[PDB]
Design a protein around this ligand. Structure first.
Ligand SMILES: Nc1nc2c(ncn2[C@@H]2O[C@@H]3COP(=O)(O)O[C@H]4[C@@H](O)[C@H](n5cnc6c(=O)[nH]c(N)nc65)O[C@@H]4COP(=O)(O)O[C@H]3[C@H]2O)c(=O)[nH]1
Ligand SMILES: Nc1nc2c(ncn2[C@@H]2O[C@@H]3COP(=O)(O)O[C@H]4[C@@H](O)[C@H](n5cnc6c(=O)[nH]c(N)nc65)O[C@@H]4COP(=O)(O)O[C@H]3[C@H]2O)c(=O)[nH]1
Ligand SMILES: Nc1nc2c(ncn2[C@@H]2O[C@@H]3COP(=O)(O)O[C@H]4[C@@H](O)[C@H](n5cnc6c(=O)[nH]c(N)nc65)O[C@@H]4COP(=O)(O)O[C@H]3[C@H]2O)c(=O)[nH]1
Ligand SMILES: Nc1nc2c(ncn2[C@@H]2O[C@@H]3COP(=O)(O)O[C@H]4[C@@H](O)[C@H](n5cnc6c(=O)[nH]c(N)nc65)O[C@@H]4COP(=O)(O)O[C@H]3[C@H]2O)c(=O)[nH]1
Ligand SMILES: [Mg+2]
Ligand SMILES: [Mg+2]
Lengths: 322, 328
């Protein structure tokens, strides 16, 4: 994994290093005698550590240190400056210049390979750390979005974006079971857009669906409690469950849903020439009692209320308690 | 786990003076905490509790061998990877070689000036921090990647594979066929298609049950997948008892040749059936069509049409036979 790039004008020092990194596998070596090519050599072999001689003819090791730190290609490679006359004034200045280590020309072979490996691993760990951090951010972003999408396809109505039929009915069933234990009121609204069939085959589908999308927008705005839930049972049929809600409160939301839906003023000629889209709403409510009683009985009640509503003129609200 | 720049230095020296001199250089930098320990006996325990990013260890201490204490750091799991800068008194360049072998990562002659000190303190801590973060990222990465692979595998079976036969399902086949069609328009090559239906299958399913019907299907499927062996060939279960086979760069002669291998090898499976009369076997009606896409309004759909027609005519001319699309 290691690749040592040594820079020094002394052809012998370059050898004392080569002959110590020899009996050491996993660590490539490279020797450069001409400082004028050092920067070049560095942008090619891509070392994991650079041993840079401080004093050479024509260029000092610190102006080369500024070169290695000039391009991304090598700006992160750790460098060990090698000195001859150990002058703690230049030493101090080397570190200030960013030098990562300082060695009085060639120490014990055991130490020289220990520093070479420690720096290389550090260099690679930083490389792999950022790389990982980046790939990780992508992965989690991907996974989060993928799950959002699958969730939506799983429990939501495509057009309306509201919950689908089975998601809703399963919630209704679990809410019924909990209202049975807590002996509380469970209200349900069955919402049908009036004369929608008539409307659909006279304005097309894109107009029908566009209207159903709008009505759905007035339906979710009707309930706001975290435990409240609205659905598009299918076609122009919607549903809303309101845990812990009383007949009166349920009635309020129904009426509020009806009113806001009408204030959309979606033109339609069936109720007669100059009217607009409206909805009939059946409202039911109960406190689950023991014995038989399934949530299906609450639904039968809402449907009856819905039927009564339609047969009394539509665009109004029907209630039922038993 | 440790956040970026969270430097924690642990100095283990017996001389409280050396401690104080450092316990200052590191007060002018809040982005780095400090902790001094004078008892070698607790050095490891202390490091285990404060969790340092770098430790400065005194090589010579009373009643404790220095090079052995280092080895003790490499033996504790939580400190094994912590960089150690050994502090030498008055110098000794012999202990030095031994120190690095023992696990030392850096060598300092008792307290250099705050500049070289912190450079090394931060260089080593950053290094330790990086390694710790790399492994936490690598771990969370494989976890995330696995979750995605698992999901992708589920979607593949659902989207382009048929559970029972293990063959390609219909949308995958249709998609592939369309691509082959377009490629054939470009290369002006012949594209053949076979539509394969098991004869009297329903009849067989209500008489022998799903268990047996499914196994019959699994068998036909196998005889079909063997009728074509080119890397670009593709066999698919097209429906209930309906299958399909698309053969790129195949002439009408080749297509009907392979059509017959199927009919033949299916009938030789000899899956007893009481239809169309006692003592029968499950046979296959096949429809073959082949075309060279010719430009203008004509898609891969026409190729499917033609094979369906040949299959209709084959089913109506007695079954257990090959029907060939008539050319005007
Ligand atoms: N006008 C009106 N608006 C309603 C009603 N029910 C729900 N909302 C709307 O829905 C938001 C969230 O309701 P939540 O999920 O029950 O979450 C609620 C609930 O858990 C709690 N909370 C607030 N007010 C009451 C209260 O009077 N009784 C109870 N039991 N909890 C309350 O605080 C949360 C947030 O409250 P908000 O900030 O007000 O935000 C409320 C409010 O804007 C209602 O009966 N009348
Ligand atoms: N399931 C459900 N039912 C709804 C919602 N909004 C209204 N209701 C029903 O309508 C009744 C009166 O609502 P309100 O006029 O807004 O008058 C409300 C409101 O002024 C206040 N209130 C209760 N909960 C909240 C809340 O979460 N946020 C705020 N801001 N006010 C609340 O208390 C009054 C009476 O509350 P309740 O006794 O609960 O009786 C409520 C409830 O049965 C809703 O989003 N979900
Ligand atoms: N143009 C051309 N290419 C040739 C010919 N013979 C071999 N190849 C190439 O060699 C691959 C492997 O050939 P294989 O070992 O005979 O193994 C073959 C062979 O066992 C079988 N196969 C495919 N087509 C025919 C055929 O027309 N007759 C027979 N008897 N076997 C076939 O499928 C295997 C893999 O088929 P491929 O995926 O297409 O992959 C083929 C194909 O790319 C040839 O006469 N003409
Ligand atoms: N798509 C597809 N078509 C098939 C396959 N097996 C047979 N055919 C069709 O049947 C024709 C004659 O096949 P053959 O009797 O094996 O006679 C073959 C065979 O002896 C030899 N040949 C061609 N390709 C291969 C190959 O990949 N492997 C071997 N072993 N022989 C090959 O060339 C003869 C004529 O080849 P073609 O001109 O291509 O004409 C072929 C081809 O149109 C198959 O696995 N996939
Ligand atoms: Mg020199
Ligand atoms: Mg001491």
């Amino acid at each position: 994994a290691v690749m040592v790039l040594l820079v020094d004008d002394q052809a012998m020092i370059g050898e004392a290093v080569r002959r110590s990194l020899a009996s050491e596998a996993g660590i490539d070596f490279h020797f450069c005698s001409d400082p004028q090519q050092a920067v070049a050599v560095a942008n090619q072999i891509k070392p994991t550590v650079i041993l840079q001689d401080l004093v050479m003819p024509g260029v000092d090791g610190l102006t080369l240190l500024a070169a290695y730190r000039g391009n991304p290609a090598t700006r992160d490679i750790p460098i060990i400056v090698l000195s001859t006359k150990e002058e703690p004034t230049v030493k101090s200045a080397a570190f200030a210049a960013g030098a990562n280590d300082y060695l009085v020309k060639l120490p014990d072979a055991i130490e020289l390979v220990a520093r070479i490996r420690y720096h290389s691993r550090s260099y690679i760990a930083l490389q792999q750390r950022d790389e990982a951090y980046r790939a990780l951010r992508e992965s989690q972003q991907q996974l989060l979005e993928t799950n959002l999408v699958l969730q939506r396809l799983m429990n939501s109505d495509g057009l309306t974006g509201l919950s689908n039929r089975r998601h809703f009915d399963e919630y209704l069933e679990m809410e019924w079971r909990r209202s049975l234990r807590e002996q509380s009121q469970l209200s349900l609204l069955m919402i049908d857009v009036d004369y929608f069939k008539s409307y659909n085959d006279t304005f097309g589908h894109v107009a029908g669906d566009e209207a159903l999308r709008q009505v759905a927008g007035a339906i979710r705005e009707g309930c706001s409690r975290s435990s409240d839930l609205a659905a598009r049972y299918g076609g122009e049929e919607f549903a809303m469950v309101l845990p812990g809600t009383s007949p009166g409160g349920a009635r309020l939301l129904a009426e509020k849903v009806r009113r806001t839906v009408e204030s959309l003023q979606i033109s339609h000629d069936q109720p007669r020439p100059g009217s607009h889209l409206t909805v009939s709403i059946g409202v039911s409510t109960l406190v689950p009692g023991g014995g038989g009683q399934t949530f299906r009985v609450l639904i039968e009640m809402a449907d009856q209320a819905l039927y009564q509503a339609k047969n009394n003129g539509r665009n109004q609200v029907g209630l039922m308690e038993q």
